[PDB]
């Protein structure tokens, strides 16, 4: 999930951007 | 040295950012 | 005597902090 | 919408619980 991608690890602008709407 | 991890309140404010007019869902879950 | 509108990154954070584990859609063009 | 309600015009708790999931 985001948490794990984002929070945990480090996400990239395209992953965060996968989870909009 | 400085931090690159989006967690909590600052998750959502990046969301809001980057998704604009699409929107998005979230829920907080560990 | 403040601004009482939510607007937007304001919009964001009462709502996570009002929903909280509920979570929410976050649809502005609504 | 939310942004009308709450940002244009004032909401109460009761209509912003109301956006929640």
């Known amino acids: ?3 794990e991608q984002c929070c945990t690890s480090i996400c990239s ?3 965060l951007e996968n ?3 | 040295f400085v ?3 989006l967690c909590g309140e600052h998750l959502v404010e990046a969301l809001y950012l980057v ?3 699409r929107g ?3 829920t907080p879950k560990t």
Do not use: D
Request: charged content about 5%; some cysteine; overall charge negative.
């Open chain 1, 1 to 3: 999930g985001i948490v």
């Open chain 1, 13 to 15: 602008l395209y992953q």
């Open chain 1, 19 to 21: 989870y909009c709407n």
């Open chain 2, 3 to 5: 931090n690159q991890h």
């Open chain 2, 19 to 21: 998704c604009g007019e």
């Open chain 2, 24 to 26: 998005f869902f979230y």
